[PDB]
Amino acid sequence: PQITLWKRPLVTIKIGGQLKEALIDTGADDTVLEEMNLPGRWKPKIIGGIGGLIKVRQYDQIPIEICGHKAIGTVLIGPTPANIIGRNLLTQIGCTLNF
Amino acid sequence: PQITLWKRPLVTIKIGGQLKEALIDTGADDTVLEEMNLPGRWKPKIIGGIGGLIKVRQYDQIPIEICGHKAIGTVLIGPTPANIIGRNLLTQIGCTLNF
């Protein structure tokens, strides 16, 4: 749909059989979710933001649904205050910025 | 315009009579810019990002332009890796997410 930015762009997403809240973040290269259990092997990955770099866990080819749109891609797990949906998944559901 | 997310949404902004590249960040509550110069009162402020915290200078009622679109609001100046446009200004230029 069309989401305004008066408030944080939090939408529902589903991963596994679980409903979660996540932020549509055009400023995130990657998708970062709050600590949770995911299937299969992982590899380490260093990411950064204001504040510095940080090492987190990287899981690949993870099915995820965002506002009813299915996507598959890399998901990172780390100490984030919120579930973040980044550009790697946003492009997959055809999400764009407009003004 | 309509901006896809295959690459970082960098756009031209103008502040203090100077043009610059800045990231359209729907995941940012605030607007933070790389060390520069600004007028009027400023007061410190600590803010958090994915790698920890940084102390910045908060400036209120700062006129700024994004792609020539006028906005006025709070702007933080500090050691950020890159200029970040937050929702506080994006709402002001009618920027929305679509998919």
* Residue position matching structure tokens 């995941």: B27
Give me the phi and psi of B96, to 5 degrees please: -135, 160
**B87 vs A: CB within 8 A:** yes
Residues B79 and B54 sit within 8 Å (Cβ to Cβ): yes
Query: Kindly report the CA angle at B32 between A9 and A11, in degrees rounded to 5?
Result: 10
* Distance from C-alpha of B56 to C-alpha of B46, rounded to nearest angstrom: 6
Q: Identify from A26, A33, A77 which residue to disrupt to test chain B contact, counting B C-beta atoms within 10 A and taking the largest count.
A: A26
Looking up tokens 């980044």 gives A86
Of A27, A47, A97, nearest to B84 by CB-CB distance is A27
Strands (E) across chain B are located at 2-3, 10-15, 18-24, 32-33, 42-49, 52-66, 69-77, 84-85, 96-98
CA of B98, closest CA in chain A: separation in Å? 5
Burial of B44 per CB tally in 10 Å (0-12, 13-18, 19+): exposed
What angle (nearest 5°) sits at the alpha carbon of residue B86, between those of residues A12 and B18? 155
DSSP assignment letter at B91: G
Q: Three-class SS of residue A68?
A: coil
Between the two ends of chain B, the Cα-to-Cα distance in Å is 15
Q: What CATH number was assigned to the domain covering residues B1-99?
A: 2.40.70.10
> Quick check: helix, strand or coil at residue A81?
coil
Residue A11, helix vs strand vs coil: strand
Burial class (CB in 10 A: 0-12, 13-18, 19+), A61: exposed
Method of determination is: X-ray
CA distance A97 to B58: 27
